[PDB]
Amino acid sequence: AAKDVKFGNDARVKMLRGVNVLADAVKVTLGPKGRNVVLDKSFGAPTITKDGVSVAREIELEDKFENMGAQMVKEVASKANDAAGDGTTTATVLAQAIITEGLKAVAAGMNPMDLKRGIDKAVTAAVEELKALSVPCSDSKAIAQVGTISANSDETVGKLIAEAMDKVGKEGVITVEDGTGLQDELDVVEGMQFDRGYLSPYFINKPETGAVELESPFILLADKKISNIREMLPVLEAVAKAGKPLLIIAEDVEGEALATLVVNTMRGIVKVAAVKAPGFGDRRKAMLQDIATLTGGTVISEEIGMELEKATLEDLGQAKRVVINKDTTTIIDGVGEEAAIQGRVAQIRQQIEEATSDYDREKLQERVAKLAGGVAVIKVGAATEVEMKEKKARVEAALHATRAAVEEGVVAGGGVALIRVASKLADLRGQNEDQNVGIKVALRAMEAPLRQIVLNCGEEPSVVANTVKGGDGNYGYNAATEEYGNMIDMGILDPTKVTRSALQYAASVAGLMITTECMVTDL
Amino acid sequence: AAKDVKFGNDARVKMLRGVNVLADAVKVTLGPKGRNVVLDKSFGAPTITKDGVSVAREIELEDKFENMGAQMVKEVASKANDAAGDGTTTATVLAQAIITEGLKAVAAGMNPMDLKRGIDKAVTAAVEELKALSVPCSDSKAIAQVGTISANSDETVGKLIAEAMDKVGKEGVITVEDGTGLQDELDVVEGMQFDRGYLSPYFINKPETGAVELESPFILLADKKISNIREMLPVLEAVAKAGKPLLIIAEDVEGEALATLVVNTMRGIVKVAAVKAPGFGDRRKAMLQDIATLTGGTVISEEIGMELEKATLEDLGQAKRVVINKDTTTIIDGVGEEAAIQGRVAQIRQQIEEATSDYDREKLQERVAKLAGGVAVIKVGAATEVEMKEKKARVEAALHATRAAVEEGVVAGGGVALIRVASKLADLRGQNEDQNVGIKVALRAMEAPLRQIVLNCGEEPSVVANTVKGGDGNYGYNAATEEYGNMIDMGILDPTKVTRSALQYAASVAGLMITTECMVTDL
Amino acid sequence: AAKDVKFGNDARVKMLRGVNVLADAVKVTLGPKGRNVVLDKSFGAPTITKDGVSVAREIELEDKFENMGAQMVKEVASKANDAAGDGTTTATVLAQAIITEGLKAVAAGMNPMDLKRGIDKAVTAAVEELKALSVPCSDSKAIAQVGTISANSDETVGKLIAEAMDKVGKEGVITVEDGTGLQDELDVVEGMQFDRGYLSPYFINKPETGAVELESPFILLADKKISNIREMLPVLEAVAKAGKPLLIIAEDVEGEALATLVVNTMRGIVKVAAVKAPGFGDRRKAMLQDIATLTGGTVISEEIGMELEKATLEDLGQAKRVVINKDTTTIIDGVGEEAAIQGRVAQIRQQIEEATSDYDREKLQERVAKLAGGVAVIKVGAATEVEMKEKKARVEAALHATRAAVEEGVVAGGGVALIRVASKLADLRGQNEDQNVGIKVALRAMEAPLRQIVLNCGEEPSVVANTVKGGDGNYGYNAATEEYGNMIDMGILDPTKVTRSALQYAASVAGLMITTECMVTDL
Amino acid sequence: AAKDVKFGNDARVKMLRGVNVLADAVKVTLGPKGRNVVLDKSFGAPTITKDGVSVAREIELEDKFENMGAQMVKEVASKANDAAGDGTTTATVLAQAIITEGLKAVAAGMNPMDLKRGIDKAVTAAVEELKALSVPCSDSKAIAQVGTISANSDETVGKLIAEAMDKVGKEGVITVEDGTGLQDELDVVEGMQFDRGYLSPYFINKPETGAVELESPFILLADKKISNIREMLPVLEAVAKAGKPLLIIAEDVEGEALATLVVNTMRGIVKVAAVKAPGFGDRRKAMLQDIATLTGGTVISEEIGMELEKATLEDLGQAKRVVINKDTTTIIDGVGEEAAIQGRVAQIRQQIEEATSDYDREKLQERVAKLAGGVAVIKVGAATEVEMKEKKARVEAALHATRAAVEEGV
Ligand SMILES: Nc1ncnc2c1ncn2[C@@H]1O[C@H](COP(=O)(O)OP(=O)(O)OP(=O)(O)O)[C@@H](O)[C@H]1O
Ligand SMILES: Nc1ncnc2c1ncn2[C@@H]1O[C@H](COP(=O)(O)OP(=O)(O)OP(=O)(O)O)[C@@H](O)[C@H]1O
Ligand SMILES: [Mg+2]
Ligand SMILES: [Mg+2]
């Protein structure tokens, strides 16, 4: 309908207020000092998740302007959240600080573009500093510590992550499932993961993550793309009879014919998924073979001349469950044959040795590795189902963070890195004063999140911040200890990536907010 | 329903007020001095685009009269915006100044027709002056500068435009795509562009521009027009199975049979597009052949006796993506065959030499050129996806402006041309006094936009304007420098066309507004 | 009564609103092209005026808080007119300027105390600059030039002033009275003047000028503090029998019974005015003697056992006329004994010769100066009573302008001196940035008067200000002729004292108001 | 009290509305075909009138701002009638016209100060043009023609005016009184007139015309400023004993105790009127002498040690009648001593001969003109008291129209 438009400060104020409200709840929650937040649910009794984000998610602003402004922060934060796996709150906190200052500058009537530029400039510098600052992740003990951080003092989660990580291998993928019982169960499972996208978001399953999980999926592998439904159809009919969800692997699943029917026709009355077959060329075929063996299903190729229509259900393999995400598709456990799987691995392994070339070796080795690695499953127990779900969610979050953290390496947590970088940053200047202030603002923003933790502590963040800044190297404040010590030595480290991601996003948001002269809303 | 009608000044005032509101937001934004504007979105967090227009777009007036009046300006401005590629704001600014004065004249009770005539007369004179004034665009360095202007101090965009422009060639078309990653990628791609319209706006794709982009379009080329669906249909069915969007090239696509089904029946459940085959006569056929080779598809002709029905999907070529606009249709990249494409070019090239006649040579050379030129693709990276989109939009705008600017040649920016012309204009007189005042009004209007920039500077526009006027030749004020220098030497130049376009449209709008005695609204 | 209390920005917006009503009403009258202001009167037809002091006197607001803001600025600004004989409207314009931008900065989070320190510094330096810019006015030629300028270019008024000042000293006491005919008269007479105003404003007599004239009054000298009428009734009765008015010069009159009756009761039956004796301590007694001998009366001192109960008419002194105002009492023609007066002057002259300290000598000769100085009475003659009365007003005005001019010289009028000194102070800085914006706030405020003046001229104030600032020395804009030039040569100047008082008082309230955190008023 | 403040165009529309009500009400009566206006009265039945001045007098608006607009135009326009004896309605009509279009231009963004300068110029030139267009009215034939025209074509009224003016000068003082019968009477009498009106409007007597008539009043001449009643009570008592009204000609009467009591208290017990002495400075004193000798009274001057406390009735002068208005006092029949009056006129006549400057001579002869001029009294006779009263009004009107005509033509 008609839209109400505001411009200038008036627009800004609304956004600012909205931002603060969202930020405030988040800020307190963030940090181990803060307590877990529960989100009220209209649907049922509130769900308790240890997410800064969740608070934000719940929070809606009645005021459209404020709400919209609030929304902006959240969306960006989530984006950071996804990539980093953590630091949703941090970005939010950072954004708020930046925005407020930026707004003030706007109040000043300095030209905001420069501020943004300065902020961007500062951010870039900070990022560089952070990268240098970052130090490689420590051993599993560190990993547990990393896990704990994601845990927010969930020791078990960290332990589970470490334990799972050790057995599977850090590289090896770990999957989380609801626990059978109170006691957690860690079982290694056979399976392979190949990075393949899901053809359409439509395919994307119920859960919020958007990864699709199929229960007892049926796997059809075709080297050939499926041009038309019709050939596929007779396969589908059998599948339908089984009623088990169908997962399709094709070199390409032709979108409209299959997908249009699948999505529109198949609500989830039937379940279907499609993924591109991993790899390309012979390797792709080889990969398919590896997959096929693991599944225990068979693959049909034109070259073979096997017909999809001819192929029965039996040809299709089955998986205990499959999870698909945009980046990757994995099969948690193909039923497979134990002997069959092993034999294939050996055969591939032999091939790897056989090939003189590195290239051949690499492909083969990669192929074996996927099968060999298998998948690890973690069960989270809980006193109650509700708890288990909550725990599970936390565990999952911890796992992505840990995995990210290890690869990236760890940097001092507590926003120590942020503060540390800022000091260096301060020296750096912007082209013009307006830029300069923006740069300073960014630096100020970085400092803030450290303070917030301190505030939760109840210690005066000023002193802590000052002290922290004074210390060279990794100098930081440990909330739990409430003692000064090396962050690394303490072993409380925030992932470089997460920190970097959050900062950049927040800066982006802040810059955007500052720029936005005008807001428009519906009446 | 019932309409509320106003007449006379009362109508005028409403329009005027509405105009001012829209104008005011735009005016401030316009100019590098101004800051980028963000539009609030109900849908989601606000989108930041560097568009004067966007502010206008967002702005709606609650008052119907005001709103309608506001609307009038916007629509015209956009029209100017499209043609010029830039200067949306300028037109708006110009219009507002003109309208207000005109309204005042109306208040005066001078007969407004004459004013309009004078304004038109003044405009014409101004245009002539501008054309003479304009000086050919400078080299790529200038181009970058031109790009920067579109950039609004986006150095990268200007660089990208220049870089893309250099490689492709100014004449060569450049296409923009979202960046794969943060770093921009510029890749030359094979492809040909032929200026063909889209048969129906219905075909027009989702995006606002209305250019239709198809992903992996399938190309069917027929020399023959497709009389009826039926022959086409079997082709379509295959296409549907692929599910890949279908692009159709026909000498004429018979509108109702194909299009009625396509538009109505094919929502975008399937995607189809139709374009007329480029050229006519043998040349058209030749062009088709060139296209066909590039696509890698084949063309079916009655003369050949190949049947559309007979023709399979294979006959149809594929394109990585196709973009269509009303003026032109382009294929970003036909898969083509590298050898095949090259061979054809050579063959055509040989033909060009072979033909004695210029005419034959020209056609052949044109044909080769399209294939030879290929298309250039620019990827815009961004820290965040949102940024990338914003950046991309800016880039696109810059590119049209730059392209337009180069051909037209550049004139001093800063509204220097406008002010300069006006002084000359002032001497010119109108038939009658009422006309005279209108002429003066137009001149006044031209001056204003210079002032606005100055105002953003905070320098008193009066002095600047006076100073600017005093200087002969290209004398202007550089906002960034805040120093007086030659506009050309400064290298900050606004395209002649954009300036001309904006002025004319604004004048048209202003004239229309002045004339409009009465407004009517719904109750 | 229950109060309504406001803090911070809430009290801020309130005061700003009250100040803007007062300032905007008063400033329309500023400059040669000042507009009129209509002040309603229940007494009959409205009054159309351009006297900014009259307008201010009528300003009272409904909102208790806003009214507090207005009454504050009115009280301080009035002190300027009292001190320099002019400056109130300029003081109001400046005050509004400093307060407007000051509070903006405060609301921007800047430190109120710092802001005030900066404002205060700029004013200190600026006053120094005005002192430097001042053109002296000492020689009789200068005195006359200033006089005629003030008397609207009346050579005769300038002559009168110069003649009077020459015949009684530049710092001598000069009065203006009605003429006895066509010719002007000037005669020094036995009189005196001391800085002591009326005890009650309710003593104001016919002179609308806020003064009190008493023809042939009886001077009552009592160094006692009269709080009760009882011991004074006999005197009052005797005075009443004489029908002559009375002037009570006592140590102090307390509003218990005396000042109570003298005002509340004597509203027509008698004409009684009361003032405090000059000085304090022993000097108070000595001075009363001087006044006593001068008026031929005797002082009633309890020390000598003098009883007011027995104070007969012979004890009371007398003078041809006495004029008392806010802070001054002037005894125009003492009926003292020439020889007695000469005797005292000699007696004190001797005391000076045998003085043992600078302080003694100074005060001693200040007393002889008063007695031996006399009063210069100007009798304004004319052809008609109307002319006589009008000229008399001009003489009174020119006299107060010239006296201010002899004291601190003269400076470029038209709001040019303030904008001049301000352009010099562009490099001035303070202990910190807040203090710096404080300095800028004051400098920008110094341009308000000229810009207002030019505004009433229908001209562009930012253009004229920009031009005047770019000039040097007493170069400015003559709003009368609307041409630039040398303000002093163009005869457009103000006594440096009024420009100074205006700025200082303006900065005073502006400072207090900017450092006010809470407002209390009745509900 | 808390105020309501308006600026620019807001104050503009307000004043324009108040002016339009006033002007539109008053202008309906303009011309020979002017319409009537009904003015309500609580006193009884409404008054139907065509007198635009009466209508204006009743105009007061509810909106404080609009009322300010109306009261402004009413105050200035009234000055026209006071000055020329007519012009108020025309002044209102013109004012409304100039203000209507003026404010339109102002609202159109034109400079108010410039607009006013232009208006002022056109008026300067136009007044010059009117002066050129003017047909003189000096000869007795002309005087009579204008007189009868003003008296609704009454040849007798024109004759009266012309006769009076001839017998006392065109700029001489002429009064109109009730006749003693059928025949008109005209007789020059010892009198004088000076430009000084009543101090308080509350002194208005029976004459609804905004004037005050006093039969056989006692003239009190005091060059002092009387602010308190104390030192005047004895005189007032004596005057009261005489039952005759009183005219106080002083330097100025201050509203502290004197003007206060003289008005607020003397609302029926006595008939007292007060006016300022003519001129200023030394001339003020001289003129008071002229008035003194003329009325046969003496001036109380503090300079001579004169005390109002001892001012007896013999000090007070007397006249057959005295008429005071907004800005004029006319002493119709001074009980002065013929020879004394002639003596003064001669004394001043001598002073003129030995004058040493134009200014002295001028003012000196202005004084002898007043004393030696006398007052021409017209007695309007008729067949019935009604006719007499109606004709008298016509004579008063025609007299004021003719005097204006002799001064600047027609
Ligand atoms: N004992 C500790 N001392 C210092 N800081 C700590 C300590 N333990 C954790 N932190 C810090 O607290 C922050 C992690 O908390 P949290 O995960 O709530 O923040 P977040 O990741 O931004 O919010 P969310 O997880 O909701 O996105 C990190 O900066 C982390 O280093
Ligand atoms: N440094 C500069 N000095 C002078 N003017 C400048 C400078 N850089 C750009 N400009 C001017 O600013 C204007 C371009 O800004 P902008 O693109 O916002 O205006 P617009 O094209 O009318 O608005 P929109 O792009 O929203 O349609 C041109 O007149 C351009 O010459
Ligand atoms: Mg976290
Ligand atoms: Mg542009």
Residue numbers in the entry:
A (entry chain G), B (entry chain A), C (entry chain H): 2 to 524
D (entry chain I): 2 to 411
Sentences from the paper on this structure:
We used an ATPase mutant (D398A) with normal ATP binding but 3% of the wild-type steady-state ATPase activity. The separated classes produced six distinct 3D reconstructions of GroEL-ATP states, three with ATP bound in one ring and three with ATP in both rings, in addition to an unliganded (apo GroEL) population. ATP-bound rings from GroEL-ATP7 complexes are termed Rs (single), and those from GroEL-ATP14 Rd (double). For the Rs states, the fitted models reveal three distinct new conformations between the T state (apo GroEL) and the GroES-bound state (R-ES), termed Rs1, Rs2, and Rs-open. Very similar patterns are seen in the Rs and Rd series, but the Rs series is simpler and is sufficient to illustrate the major steps in the trajectory. The initial step after ATP binding is an en bloc, 35° sideways tilt of the intermediate and apical domains as a single rigid body (to the left in Figure 4, top panel, Rs1) about the equatorial-intermediate hinge. Pivoting of these domains about the equatorial-intermediate hinge closes helix M (green, containing the catalytic residue D398 in the native structure) over the ATP-binding pocket. The tilt breaks the salt bridge between intermediate and apical domains of adjacent subunits (R197-E386) in apo GroEL and replaces it by a new contact between K80 and E386 in the adjacent equatorial domain, as previously described (Ranson et al., 2001). In addition, the contact E255-K207 between adjacent apical domains of apo GroEL is broken and replaced by a contact between E255 at the end of helix I (orange) and K245 at the end of helix H (red) on the next subunit. However, our new data show that after ATP binding, adjacent apical domains are linked by intersubunit salt bridges between the ends of helices H and I, thus maintaining the continuous collar of binding sites facing the cavity, albeit with different orientations of the plane of the binding surface.
